[PDB]
Ligand binder design. Structure first.
Ligand SMILES: *[C@@H]1O[C@H](CO)[C@@H](O[C@@H]2O[C@H](CO)[C@@H](O[C@@H]3O[C@H](CO)[C@@H](O)[C@H](O[C@H]4O[C@H](CO)[C@@H](O)[C@H](O)[C@@H]4O)[C@@H]3O)[C@H](O)[C@H]2NC(C)=O)[C@H](O)[C@H]1NC(C)=O
Ligand code: NAG
Ligand code: NAG
Lengths: 48, 49, 114, 97, 97, 49, 49
């Protein structure tokens, strides 16, 4: 939250955009991994 | 949760067969990446211009 | 090798459903697989036997091959599609007798009419 | 900020920035490595359910040890826990065949 | 709120650290009951899925019947399985118990 | 540098692209292949002010 | 290629003939495939179209 720091941070480019996008993609990857995995465990027919 | 078709077991020497009466064909599409773009860098120029 | 050059018996390896045939085309950074599978629908429930034995000749038993023996007396259907047909030597195999096999005494199919 | 004026204050803040940027880059690099690994592993889990659980396997060592008979699956904290029941022979004898 | 009204559970509490350090742990895609539903439906499909040709039909047969077909399929004859059904069930039960 | 310390052989690392290759691997013998080396720089032909 | 034992011989057979062997191999009987050859081809064509 310090403005002086934020001012200096800006000189490193869109650093935080890169951090957020990299993690966003990495997190989507698990939702996709899970969705695919369960779609395959799922039975068509099953007994109670 | 999408429940599977429930097929009961029988108290007998017989069994229940849940068997299709109809069918269709469908296509599962799949992409497999085999490569990445190949890149080289003129590191000396990149860093010092 | 598994999908395209062969029919696969591995559930879920190729596409969903039962694999029949796959095709391959190139894609920007790899291959694009086109898996054609068999998708069943409108399932019904029928009553099936584990096998059938000659009631008079209890050691002479059959089991279905790649299908089921269903009540309708007994007839055969392939495992992926309900379509009753007569039980014949082409859709049965002889097996050792089991407690779960039915003892049939009337309309004995040709493999048991011995 | 409280102790130093801008020409030195800047240098000190900048050290903290470099260290924290480095930390975040390392973190992200590992989340990408770990998520790539978990994704490959998830496909292995997919194959085991189809090969192991929904089918009897004839592949030695794919499922469990010994001859595979039946497998079960329950969930685990970060994945699946496979329960492979195999047939284990013992007391072998030699006969002539 | 738990981290404010109770505070950290112990030294180095990485859950309460989230609101302090600037990071957040996100929830998983599926809740527990849904994951349980998937493996429960899987359990009930085992005997009738690994039974015959094709993946399209389901044989609602007893688990025990499935085991005997699985054992026969690996080289144990039917005469043996028939004489030993209780022995086989007991060994199976010991393996899981 | 020979065992006795004298320089008997050398590469001018800016002479050509092949020389750049030898220098980047710090060796007089590099394996066969296709390698990227520093780009051929465009140089100013004048100035505008 | 996906027709019989070994990877050494090639059966130059119609695609359609291959499909019917593939369907028979998964549990659809020959009586069914014979009665429905046009229905099967149409469903296949719908899946790809
Ligand atoms: C179709 O006909 C068959 C053939 O008759 C019939 O299956 C037979 O059923 C009888 C029982 O009705 C089985 O006989 C016994 O059943 C008891 C049940 O607890 C077993 O405990 C006995 O085992 C002891 O005795 C055996 C004698 O050799 C010993 O080998 C064994 O180790 C035990 O000491 C015994 O099994 C009979 O075995 C089966 N037959 C087969 C081939 O399994 C079948 O049920 C009829 N079909 C239908 C649907 O009714
Ligand atoms: C019906 O199920 C019960 C459950 O214990 C069992 O004891 C009984 O023997 C079964 N009857 C038949 C015909 O299998
Ligand atoms: C199979 O499903 C399709 C879907 O529209 C339907 O048109 C066709 O009549 C169905 N066949 C049978 C036998 O039900």
């Amino acid at each position: 939250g310090f403005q002086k720091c934020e001012q200096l941070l800006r000189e490193y480019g869109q650093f935080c955009s890169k951090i957020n996008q990299a993690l966003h993609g990495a997190n989507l990857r698990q939702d996709d991994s899970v969705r695919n995995l369960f779609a395959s465990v799922k039975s068509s027919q099953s007994s109670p | 949760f999408n429940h599977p078709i429930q097929v009961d077991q029988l108290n007998s020497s017989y069994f229940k067969l849940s068997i299709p009466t109809n069918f269709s064909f469908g296509v599962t599409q799949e992409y497999i990446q085999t490569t990445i773009q190949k890149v080289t860098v003129d590191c000396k120029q990149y860093v010092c211009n | 090798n598994e999908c395209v050059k062969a029919q696969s018996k591995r559930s879920g390896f190729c596409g969903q459903g039962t694999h029949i045939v796959s095709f391959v085309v190139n894609a920007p950074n790899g291959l694009y697989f086109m898996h054609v599978g068999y998708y069943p629908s409108n399932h019904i429930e029928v009553v099936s036997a584990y096998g059938l034995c000659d009631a008079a000749n209890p050691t002479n038993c059959i089991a279905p091959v790649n299908g089921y023996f269903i009540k309708t007396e007994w007839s055969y259907t392939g495992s992926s599609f309900y379509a009753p047909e007569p039980i014949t030597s082409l859709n049965t195999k002889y097996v050792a007798p089991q407690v779960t096999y039915q003892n049939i005494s009337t309309n004995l199919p040709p493999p048991l009419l011995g | 900020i409280q102790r130093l004026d801008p020409p030195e204050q800047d240098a000190q803040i900048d050290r903290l920035i470099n260290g924290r940027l480095t930390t975040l880059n390392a973190f992200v690099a590992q989340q990408l490595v770990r998520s790539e690994s978990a994704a490959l592993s998830a496909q292995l889990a997919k194959d085991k359910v189809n090969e192991c659980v929904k089918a009897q396997s004839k592949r030695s060592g794919f499922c469990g040890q010994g001859t595979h008979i039946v497998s079960f699956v329950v969930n685990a904290p970060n994945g699946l826990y496979f329960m492979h029941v195999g047939y284990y022979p013992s007391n072998h004898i030699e006969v002539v065949s | 709120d738990d981290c404010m009204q109770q505070g950290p559970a112990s030294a180095r509490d990485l859950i309460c650290a989230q609101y302090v350090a600037g990071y957040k742990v996100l929830p998983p895609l599926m809740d527990v009951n849904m994951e349980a539903a998937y493996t429960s439906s899987l359990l009930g499909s085992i005997a009738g899925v690994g039974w015959t040709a094709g993946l399209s039909s389901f044989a609602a047969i007893p688990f025990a019947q499935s085991i005997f077909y699985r054992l026969n399929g690996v080289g144990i004859t039917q005469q043996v399985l028939s004489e030993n059904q209780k022995l086989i069930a007991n060994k199976f039960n010991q393996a899981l118990g | 540098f020979s065992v006795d310390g004298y320089i008997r052989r050398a590469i001018d690392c800016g002479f050509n692209d092949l020389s750049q290759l030898h220098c980047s691997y710090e060796s007089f013998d590099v394996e066969s292949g296709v390698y990227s080396v520093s780009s051929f720089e465009a140089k100013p032909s004048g100035s505008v002010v």
